[PDB]
C-alpha cells in the first residue's frame, strides 16, 4: 500500500478489482483519465503496452487487469490453500476472460447486428460455470474451494454486466442465480454496489450496455 | 507426475509447455485427438469449456493453456523468487497472450486479406517486449529476473512462429533477436527443436503459417 487505480471513467476492466479491495476492507485512490486526455495529439507517459488500467501498490507499478487481480490474490491471501486450488482458480479466471473478450468485441465493434447472435449463444458459454458450481458442494460455497478468491470477484462482475445485456440470461441456471444473490448480499460488496461512485459510473465507454 | 497432454496433432497452444517440460528434464505422454475424432457425437461432451488442450498431472486434470503453464511454473519452481517477479511474469505472459490471440484470429479467420495489415502493425506489438529486455540487465538474462520462467517459454514460442509468418520481423529488434538465439542454444531446447516429433508437426491446424 497505498493502492492506486488509473483508468477511464468507466467500470469495464476495473470494477472487479474495485470490489475485491472494497470487500477486504482496503481503500484506494482513484485517478481518472478522460478520453480527451488519452487521445488528443502528442502525449505519451510510459504505458508499457499502451493501454489501461495501471495499478500501483506501494512502489510497484503493474499493467494488465488480470495480472493485477492475481497480485491482489497473492498478497491478500485470496489464491486458495494449495496448488490444486491455485491451478483451478486460474482455469476459471481464464474462462471468464474468454467470455469477457467476446463481450468487449460486441459492445465496441458489432453491437447493432451482433447482439441477437450473442444473446443466442450466451447460454452455451455460461453453462460451464454452472457445472463447476454443482461439482463443488452443490454450488453452496464459492467457484473454487471454501473461501472467496479473486476468481469469484471477476466472475461476479461478468455475470452482473450480462444481466444488463440480457435481462433473464441466468433464469435457466439456478446455481449461478443464487451465487450472484449470495455474493451480492455480503455487506462490504452490497455497500459498494449501492455507492454513488459506482452507480454514476457507466459500464462501458461508448454508452452501449 | 506422470504428465499427459491431450491435444490436436498441431503445435499451437501446446508447444510452449512441451518446451518447458523438455527443458526441465521432464517426460510426458502425448495423446493425440484428430479433427475427425473431434466430430463424433456421444463421445465428445467431456471437456469443461469444450476445447483443448487438456493436461494431466498425477490425479489433477486441467484446462486452459495458460493455467497449465502457471501450474508447471509453481510446481517446478519457474515462477520467480518473490511477489514482484511473480506479478511481472504475469504481466508479460498476458501481453504474449494478447498477441497470440490476434495471430490465431489471422490464421483462422482472415489470412488472405489480413496478412498485409498484420505484418505492418507487428513491429508496434513486439516493441514492448524489446523495452522490457533493455530494462533488465540490458536483455542479457531473461524477460524477468535472473532465472528462466514459464513466461520465457511462452514468449520464445510466440516469436518463433512470427519469424515463419514474417521472416525478418526481428531485424529491428537486437535484444529480441539475441534472446531467441540464446534460449534456442540451450541443449535441452535445441534437442527438442531438432526432434522429428516437433518438425513433422505443423504449427497450425489449417496449413496456414
Ligand atoms: N489485455 C488488457 C486490455 C486493456 C484494455 O482493454 N485497455 C483499453 C481500455 S478497456 C476498454 C475501454 C476503452 C476506452 C474507454 N473510454 O472511455 O475511452 C472505455 C473502455 C484501452 O487502453 N483502450 C485505449 C487504447 O487502446 O489506447 C488488460 O486486460 O489490461
Ligand atoms: N483460451 C483457451 C483456448 C483453447 C483453444 O483455442 N482450443 C481450440 C484448439 S487451439 C486452435 C486449433 C483448433 C483446431 C485445430 N485442428 O487441427 O482442428 C488446430 C488448432 C479448440 O478446441 N478448437 C476446437 C473447438 O473450438 O471446438 C486455451 O488457451 O486453452
From Swiss-Prot, chains A, B:
Positions of post-translational N6-succinyllysine modification: 102, 115
Q: Name one GO biological process term.
A: response to ethanol
Q: GST N-terminal domain spans which residues?
A: 1-80
Indicate where this protein resides in the cell: Cytoplasm; Mitochondrion; Nucleus
Q: Which GO terms describe its molecular function?
A: glutathione transferase activity; JUN kinase binding; protein serine/threonine kinase inhibitor activity
In which tissues does this protein get expressed?
Answer: Ubiquitously expressed.
Which residues are recorded with the post-translational modification Phosphotyrosine? 3
Give me the reactions it catalyses: RX + glutathione = an S-substituted glutathione + a halide anion + H(+); prostaglandin J2 + glutathione = prostaglandin J2-S-(R)-glutathione; prostaglandin J2 + glutathione = prostaglandin J2-S-(S)-glutathione; prostaglandin A2 + glutathione = prostaglandin A2-S-(S)-glutathione
Would I find Ion transport among this entry's keywords?
A: no
Q: Where does glutathione bind?
A: 7, 13, 38, 44, 51-52, 64-65
The residues covered by the GST C-terminal domain are: 82-203
E.C. code? 2.5.1.18
- Establish whether keyword Kinase is in the entry: no
For this protein, the record's SUPFAM superfamilies field holds: GST C-terminal domain-like, Thioredoxin-like
Please list the residues that carry the modification Phosphothreonine.
61
**Cellular component GO terms held in the UniProt record:** cytosol; mitochondrion; nucleus; protein-containing complex
UniProt modified residues of type N6-acetyllysine: 127
Q: What does this protein do?
A: Conjugation of reduced glutathione to a wide number of exogenous and endogenous hydrophobic electrophiles. Involved in the formation of glutathione conjugates of both prostaglandin A2 (PGA2) and prostaglandin J2 (PGJ2). Participates in the formation of novel hepoxilin regioisomers. Negatively regulates CDK5 activity via p25/p35 translocation to prevent neurodegeneration.
Family designation: Belongs to the GST superfamily. Pi family.
Q: Which proteins does it associate with, and in what oligomeric form? A: Homodimer. Interacts with CDK5.
Query: What PANTHER family does the record tag this protein with?
Result: GLUTATHIONE S-TRANSFERASE (PTHR11571), GLUTATHIONE S-TRANSFERASE P (PTHR11571:SF255)
The protein depicted here goes by the name: Glutathione S-transferase P 1
- What's the encoding gene here? Gstp1
Amino acid at each position: 500500500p497505498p493502492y492506486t487505480i488509473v483508468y477511464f471513467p468507466v467500470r469495464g476492466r476495473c470494477e472487479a478489482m474495485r470490489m475485491l479491495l472494497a470487500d477486504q476492507g482496503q481503500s484506494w485512490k482513484e485517478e481518472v483519465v478522460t478520453i480527451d486526455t488519452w487521445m488528443q495529439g502528442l502525449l505519451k507517459p510510459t504505458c508499457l503496452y499502451g493501454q489501461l488500467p495501471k495499478f500501483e501498490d506501494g512502489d510497484l507499478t503493474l499493467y494488465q487487469s488480470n495480472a493485477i487481480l492475481r497480485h491482489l490474490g497473492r498478497s491478500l491471501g485470496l489464491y486458495g490453500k494449495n496448488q490444486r486450488e491455485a491451478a483451478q482458480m486460474d482455469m476459471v479466471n481464464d474462462g471468464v476472460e474468454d467470455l469477457r473478450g467476446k463481450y468487449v468485441t460486441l459492445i465496441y465493434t458489432n453491437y447493432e447486428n451482433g447482439k441477437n447472435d450473442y444473446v443466442k449463444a450466451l447460454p452455451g458459454h455460461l453453462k460451464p460455470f454452472e457445472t463447476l458450481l454443482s461439482q463443488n458442494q452443490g454450488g453452496k460455497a464459492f467457484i473454487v474451494g471454501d473461501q472467496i478468491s479473486f476468481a469469484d470477484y471477476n466472475l461476479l462482475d461478468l455475470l452482473l454486466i450480462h444481466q444488463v445485456l440480457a435481462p433473464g440470461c441466468l433464469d435457466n441456471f439456478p446455481l449461478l442465480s443464487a451465487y450472484v444473490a449470495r455474493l451480492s448480499a455480503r455487506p462490504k460488496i452490497k455497500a459498494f454496489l449501492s455507492s454513488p461512485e459506482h452507480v454514476n459510473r457507466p459500464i462501458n465507454g461508448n454508452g452501449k450496455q
